[PDB]
Enzyme design. Sequence first.
Site, PDB file in Angstrom:
ATOM      1  N   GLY A 128       0.813  -1.192   0.000  1.00 20.45           N
ATOM      2  CA  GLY A 128       0.000   0.000   0.000  1.00 20.45           C
ATOM      3  C   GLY A 128       0.849   1.245   0.000  1.00 20.45           C
ATOM      4  N   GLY A 129       0.195   2.370   0.231  1.00 22.25           N
ATOM      5  CA  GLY A 129       0.923   3.618   0.280  1.00 22.25           C
ATOM      6  C   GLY A 129       1.343   4.050   1.666  1.00 22.25           C
ATOM      7  N   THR A 130       0.406   4.043   2.606  1.00 19.78           N
ATOM      8  CA  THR A 130       0.744   4.302   3.995  1.00 19.78           C
ATOM      9  C   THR A 130       1.386   3.103   4.668  1.00 19.78           C
ATOM     10  N   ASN A 163      -0.686 -13.473   1.547  1.00 13.93           N
ATOM     11  CA  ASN A 163      -2.076 -13.838   1.774  1.00 13.93           C
ATOM     12  C   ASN A 163      -2.584 -14.918   0.841  1.00 13.93           C
ATOM     13  N   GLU A 220      15.344 -13.320  23.759  1.00 14.89           N
ATOM     14  CA  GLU A 220      16.025 -14.597  23.877  1.00 14.89           C
ATOM     15  C   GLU A 220      15.968 -15.424  22.596  1.00 14.89           C
TER      16      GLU A 220
END
Lengths: 440, 54, 66, 427, 41
Positions: free
Chosen positions: A143-145, A206, A254
Amino acid sequence: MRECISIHVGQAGVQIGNACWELYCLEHGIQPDGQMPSDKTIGGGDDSFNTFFSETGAGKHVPRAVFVDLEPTVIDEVRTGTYRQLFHPEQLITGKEDAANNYARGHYTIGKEIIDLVLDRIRKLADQCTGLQGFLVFHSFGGGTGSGFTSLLMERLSVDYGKKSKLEFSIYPAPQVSTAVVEPYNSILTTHTTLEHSDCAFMVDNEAIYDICRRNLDIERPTYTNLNRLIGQIVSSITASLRFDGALNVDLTEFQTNLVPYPRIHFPLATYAPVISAEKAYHEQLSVAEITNACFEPANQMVKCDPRHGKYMACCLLYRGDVVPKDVNAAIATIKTKRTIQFVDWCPTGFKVGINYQPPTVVPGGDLAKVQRAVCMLSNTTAIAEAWARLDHKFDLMYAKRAFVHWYVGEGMEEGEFSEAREDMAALEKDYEEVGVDSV
Amino acid sequence: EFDLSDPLALQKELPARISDNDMRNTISGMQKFMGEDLNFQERRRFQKEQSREW
Amino acid sequence: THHDYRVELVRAAPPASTKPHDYRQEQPETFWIQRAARLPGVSDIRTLDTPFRKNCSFSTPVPLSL
Amino acid sequence: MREIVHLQAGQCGNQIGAKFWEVISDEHGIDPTGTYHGDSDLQLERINVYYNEATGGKYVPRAVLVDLEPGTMDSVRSGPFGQIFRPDNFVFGQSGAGNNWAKGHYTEGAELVDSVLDVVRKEAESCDCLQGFQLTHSLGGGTGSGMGTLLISKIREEYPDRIMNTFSVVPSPKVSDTVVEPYNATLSVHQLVENTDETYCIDNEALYDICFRTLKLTTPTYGDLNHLVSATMSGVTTCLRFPGQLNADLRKLAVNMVPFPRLHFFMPGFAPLTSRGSQQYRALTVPELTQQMFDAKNMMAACDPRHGRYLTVAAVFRGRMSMKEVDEQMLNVQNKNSSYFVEWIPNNVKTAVCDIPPRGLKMSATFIGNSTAIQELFKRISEQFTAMFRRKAFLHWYTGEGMDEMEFTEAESNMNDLVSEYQQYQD
Amino acid sequence: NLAKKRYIDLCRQGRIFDARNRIIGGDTQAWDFQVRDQKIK
């Protein structure tokens, strides 16, 4: 005092933070109005919520979360849904116009107006955490953001906090089925901030989660809820040793020690083993040896990569529920017999186990069956260098005719980043081949 | 000290654990162990009933 | 095959539960769950319906407590 | 009058020592609260070796528990006997090491070492004649092995005449659960060889090989691995608390075991362990006890002394038992099998008889043996150090703590001396 | 004066030595009345 502040960037980030955070309300006792109803006559003994939730005087618990978007329509459903009293009103940041599938808008022009406000709610949520383990980052490469502004979110967080842990859970683009055209210009150009400004990095696709949910569960035609629900069952099982008791306890510091050999090299693969349906939980015993070997399967990985192509650098198991140390140690030895999984020439020991007690929480309205055991495994593999190679092809294919490039160079983004941040990937693709080659 | 040189001390003797409910089997006497499981089979059976109903 | 291989007059139905079972809020029994107080890895027990929740009241520092 | 100050470090060290104190407190008739509720008089006569005195006739151990994470102090405080310990003896830091020798030795474990040495110097000068210390740790973690060797270095630069003793759980080779453990264990054996008087070797592999093969348990846990380490943590010090026909303290077994001051890695084993169905089929006589000290399956290290030569041998016998039959059976094992014994030491056996057995028992037996088959315990660590180290594998986790790669290279060859020092006595 | 100050310091001791309700808290019953009045306006 085992805190972690989550940062959710984008519509992918926000809608994942709606399904992670209805898990952590049911996992503990907290309702959508914020109250813990069991707080009366039983208090103080349950300090498990303190990693994620923050107490007030009224018995009301507020998360350690910041939701970021550059569009108003995604968060405004969260602001008036069921969980609308759970979130503090100032922890949900929205702009006015989104970055619009464009790296340079969310980085150089439009993301400059939210970085001054978001970096002030981070200070207020990290000046009440007495011991902070590290942040968590949920964003999308395409995406853009999710890509433009996260690369400017991480770049200040190097300066602002120094050497705290900045884990990231991302959605790398699928190699076959995508929902964009300008997708590889974004996903190439954000590699140079998930290389420097990330301490660990998890890149699911996805399309792989579609394969599991169609086949291992029985949801033909799933939506994005049943994908968000499975991602929440990994972030909980990573942090389940911070909140519930364990025979062996492993922390975010850890397994950072035990998984990344070199600091260029931090890209493991997440695989959560028993994902079966309630009807096919009737017919299958779900013992410890039977789920510890379904993590290694090339049909259950959540990235579209096959670990038979490359050599395992390290592995990190996370058992949960009704297991025993005698049987965790018994079924690790089976994996070492088979050639079909092979470790690298310079890693003779190999593993890191973690055994928790409290079994995973079923969600009402969910889809996974309520079981008594689980495994979460985070293996580091040379055979992740193919997933950037199926996207190396689609950057230079589109860039050789110089398509879509006026949408970036008119935003105040220089032209030399295209030839550089791709040739950045032309050394991290060659770094991973040499750190697996058999010794001289 | 006739008891050291009895001819029948091996007959006139008791084993250290006649049954599982015997009084002289404490932690320091290392005959009785915590992780032996006699509740194993009933616990496994009720686990299967719980699985079926879920 | 339906007419030849059909088997009826069997003791039908699943066996009786003898307890009320709901799959929503019932956790499986385990070696660990039946032997919960006498396990090496188990913290203080102060919650009902699940013994295996972390209870860090002893270990938090006196600067940082409730 | 011959006090022993217990030190114990890490999750391995705090979960071994919690069961060991449940062994001792029952052996001296001490309740979960601390009060004395015994029957004999010998139970309350030399109790000051391990226990102090509080007000109202309540006894509190001389144990100092050390940890770098704060989550193994709640496990011990609220366990079965967690209310017998003084709460100032618990030491804990608020952030762990996370399987790292350097954070144990330099970075994190050096800000915590100067607050335990204000505890132990308060418990070591409160003894009328302090016999020595103890340690219980593992060479695989961060705070067991990193700071757990920083402590020994400060002790033996401050109390050099006193006895320093260690019950090391050195890392199991073939049931292993840490990739980064051979860096921790190889860097920690130079600090064992210059700063310990004795040192015992324990593998958790060979504690499983008792519980499957010998005892025939269905589901053992770590509660039955700590249950066996404490069986031989009490048999070494049973002639200090109860009288006998022939005594041996922690020093007399050290005088008689080490011929050269670099050769102090031993191999314990405890004799009358019987499976539950075979319990009624066995009788408790003397040759039933020397057939299971010296049985090669019984040993609490995963190395076999038929591959090497016994330099010296110990034995501690508990019960009311005959001095002829004690003595004639240890000559018996020396004479049937005389290629497992070094030539240049003619008698290789030290023996000691204590009267007061473990509670509910008639006879008992314990072993400590020194071998040239324990140089096969370090070469399986060296082969998995330089296989991994020659490609600079996990090195950025250690060098960025303030180390140098030559500090690895000396710990190659200082442990490779002990391989070839022990080797020349097989020749 | 003295009896007023003595009762004031006793109720101050009672309201301050509740350790949680000193460093955190509020008055929910008054805040409901305030938000109701603001809605009316």
